[model samples]
Target: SNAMTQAFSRVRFIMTQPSHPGNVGSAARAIKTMGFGELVLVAPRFPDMTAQPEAVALASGALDVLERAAVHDTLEEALAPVTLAFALTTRPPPCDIREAAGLARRHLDDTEAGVVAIVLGTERGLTNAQIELCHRICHIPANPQYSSLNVAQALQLAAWELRYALL
Candidate 1:
């Protein structure tokens, strides 16, 4: 667990064009709760808004995540230094669809420079073009029927598995 905490310290939870700023705050709060730090916004709907009232209020104890969150114009910018990238999606999958990404946590953790990243698609989800940028798709199979999760919830599951996998 502590291994994952430090190892995943370099891990990032990237949000792509998030529609609701509140989710941004919630996501920030979630990642910090799980033991990761980096949070990047790719073309969010609100301009320079990682600190909207709702977001800040929701972030609660994680004002640090709220204050330090970065914004990028493109996914490429966000992933400039990433050694591995996981696209969070429940869609059919990616070139190599690795659901939850927890199954491969060992291999996932085994990397160069240890700069791992997870991309959470926008509220409506990733566009085909956006999905293509990632190396693998991280899917959390919930309910199989109506299994749509928001950015915060999805981030929680992915990080949960990743942290647990270190066990």
Candidate 2:
């Protein structure tokens, strides 16, 4: 199936304060590989198109995502019309995990073909205030002792899970 028409067509990746151009590049590839294309960069350390060479190299043929990526000054701007938003974090939000995911999943399951933005924090991860902006917060459960993942890795997981749900 052409990813452009898939269940996640309305999905847009939101990366906040991304420090490394390489990761942004890799993220383009990851999203494209999973049949996704929209990418929104918020306050990224490097300019969007300026990172194209590295991103294109990493993206293989998925360079369209890099070419058409959008830049935003604030998270709210990125999520303005987003109906379903998820924050990818290893750190648990102040609220209960089950409740957050349950609420998010319900919205995600019910919404039809509108904007859905998945907010991803920087390598350092989402701050409490940032997490609060999200309609729902999600954690990729890892080992209790060693639960850390790079921003790109987190994107891969969240994108895949969303794709699965759409399927």
Candidate 3:
């Protein structure tokens, strides 16, 4: 548990231009349940989405994460202090989620106070321009025919994968 908590603190889950308040709320709950507390938002549809009713309601007992979450006008600004960033996408040449977790675990172990991040895009997915901002690209190996995952759901999967790897 000690290692888990420490490892979780070194990584953050960032949502870019998330359109739904409930998804933002659910995202906080997703990572919190996995023992993570760092959540950041970039250009979310609502600047006040963290305080929206749906966000507060879906967050359930994870309101603390919502309160601690940071909001930024741009992804570059949000990742300014981060040491490593992985952009989650369905594009080709991307690493698997599990592989990304393994890489993060190795990177985290070698650096001190080094923050790694998993960046998720909106429902329409990250544009080519935004994808270039990350150090690497990764994807969840879900069924190809039905891979349209919600941003929050993707974060949950990524968080769990990293947790498993770190443990």
Most accurate candidate by TM-score: 3
Supply the TM-score for candidate 3.
0.95
Of the pair 2 and 3, which is ahead by lDDT? 3
Please give each candidate's TM-score.
0.86, 0.83, 0.95
Provide the clashing-pair count of each candidate structure. 0, 0, 0
- What is candidate 2's TM-score against the reference? 0.83
Which model is ahead, 1 or 2, in terms of TM-score?
A: 1
Q: Which residue pairs show backbone clashes in model 3?
A: none
Q: After superposition, how far is residue 75 of candidate 2 from its true place, in Å?
A: 0.4
Ranking by TM-score: 3, 1, 2
- Give lDDT tens digits, candidate 1, residues 1-167: 67655676777889898888788889988888877777889998888688689888889988898889999889999988876787877764443223445534655557646577888886568887877887777667677777776768988887776666644
Residue 10 error for model 2, in Å?
Answer: 0.8
Model 1 clashes, total count? 0
Who wins the lDDT comparison?
3
Q: State which candidate, 1 or 2, has the greater lDDT.
A: 1
